[PDB]
Design an enzyme around this catalytic site. Structure first.
Site: not given
Ligand SMILES: C=CCn1c(=O)c2cnc(Nc3ccc(N4CCN(C)CC4)cc3)nc2n1-c1cccc(C(C)(C)O)n1
Length: 259
Positions: A17, A20-21, A36, A134, A153
């Site tokens: 969402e 894109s990478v 990214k 996370d 991330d």
């Protein structure tokens, strides 16, 4: 366009969402990077803080063998861009999928190495007064040359002394965070890491909710189909103890002879 002028796209390696990478070559140095490209977050939105904190986390953490390295971040044409190192093995989620495909699995020696390496990454992040919030297979990246695991991330990263918790993946979330107790957050990373290793060891898909979710938070380790040493099993188990204070810190974790 900096993106267009400075980088040559080689392969789309991620989509979502956010955007894109791409696997890219930087024309200037000829090296490969993961770039990214995300849309602008809406005003006063969770996606806003998320993208903002990614860059700050990278800024504080900088270069470390078990954290995905940041190279630059910029914005243009109403998109945000971040240029990180390219980990050629994808994520641990990708590696687990490949094992499913060929019906292989990570042996105990490999699971210990995974736990120790990401453990060292957490020890570093925690020593800088940050928490990741996370940890899960899809956020652990793999570089092969043998293998290096790198925490990635960093969009949920927050400070222990001024915690701003964005609810992470329920499958890996410790109960006390759900209860909005943010007083022991590094132990939440430890909980999440144990379950990450349990996924790598061949456990069934983790529950998002329901009775099975609660059994785990009561301290019951998910079933692992392969034989593991009792000492390794007992370490994973204490890492998901209902009492955060009973869970080892990352420092205490990496100083286990078993690893
Ligand atoms: C800069 C973006 C965050 N990110 C990194 O920092 C990063 C570093 N290395 C890599 N390597 C990577 C990722 C995926 C794959 N593959 C995935 C599966 N395909 C079938 C084949 C290609 C092969 C090599 N990939 C990386 N990133 C990346 C790539 C895809 C998706 C995501 C998100 C943002 C969802 O976590 N992140």
């Amino acid at each position: 366009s900096r993106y267009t002028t400075e980088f040559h796209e080689l392969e789309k390696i991620g989509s979502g969402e956010f955007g894109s990478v791409f696997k890219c070559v930087k024309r200037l140095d000829g090296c490969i990077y993961a770039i990214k490209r995300s849309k602008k977050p809406l005003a006063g939105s969770v996606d806003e803080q998320n993208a903002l904190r990614e860059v700050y986390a990278h800024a504080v953490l900088g270069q470390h063998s078990h954290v995905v390295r940041y190279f630059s971040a910029w914005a243009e044409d109403d998109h945000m861009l971040i240029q990180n190192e390219y980990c050629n093995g994808g994520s641990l989620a990708d590696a687990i999928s490949e094992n499913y495909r060929i019906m292989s699995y990570f042996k105990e020696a490999e699971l210990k190495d995974l736990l120790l390496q990401v453990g060292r990454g957490l020890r570093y992040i925690h020593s800088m007064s940050l928490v990741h919030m996370d940890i899960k297979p899809s956020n652990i990246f793999i570089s092969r040359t043998k293998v290096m695991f790198k925490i990635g991330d960093l969009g949920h990263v927050t400070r222990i002394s001024s915690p701003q918790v964005e609810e992470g993946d329920s499958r890996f979330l410790a109960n006390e965070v759900l209860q909005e107790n943010y007083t022991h957050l590094p132990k939440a990373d430890i909980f999440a890491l144990a379950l990450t290793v349990v996924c790598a060891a061949g456990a069934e898909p983790l529950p998002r909710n329901g009775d099975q979710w609660h059994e785990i938070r009561q301290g019951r380790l998910p079933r692992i189909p392969q034989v593991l040493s009792q000492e390794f099993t007992e370490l994973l188990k204490v890492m998901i103890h209902p009492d955060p204070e009973r869970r080892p810190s990352a420092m205490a974790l990496v100083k286990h002879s078993v690893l």
